[PDB]
Amino acid sequence: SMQEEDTFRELRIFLRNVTHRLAIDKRFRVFTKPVDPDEVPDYVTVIKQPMDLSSVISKIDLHKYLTVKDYLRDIDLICSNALEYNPDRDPGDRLIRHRACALRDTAYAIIKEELDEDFEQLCEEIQESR
Numbered sequence: 001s002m003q004e005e006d007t008f009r010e011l012r013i014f015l016r017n018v019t020h021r022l023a024i025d026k027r028f029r030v031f032t033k034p035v036d037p038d039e040v041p042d043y044v045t046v047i048k049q050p051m052d053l054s055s056v057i058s059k060i061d062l063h064k065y066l067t068v069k070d071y072l073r074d075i076d077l078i079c080s081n082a083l084e085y086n087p088d089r090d091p092g093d094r095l096i097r098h099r100a101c102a103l104r105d106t107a108y109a110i111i112k113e114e115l116d117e118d119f120e121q122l123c124e125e126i127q128e129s130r
């Protein structure tokens, strides 16, 4: 229905705003764009489902997220990709891991404070009905 379309449009606007707040934080610059296969030719070979915040925006705009739970699975991938690709004790790896954990924690904290649980429940039930 059009009311359901209105619900998903409000979801899209909410997710666009959370993603923009993450993308303008200087800590998260490395997560804003895909990894350049020049700088890092092994990336695409190690990480099978690359994800970054620009890809998340394109997904929102393609109507790929019908719930905040699905959006958070992609935020979780940005985090787990960096834990897998940068697992060493050296400070460059530790700094990327801490930034990727902080991204994830920040997205979950904004959602805890600003997502109404009944709005998420509605999205989940429309999705499950499709």
Ligand SMILES: [Cl-]
Binding pocket: none
């Ligand atoms: Cl830096």
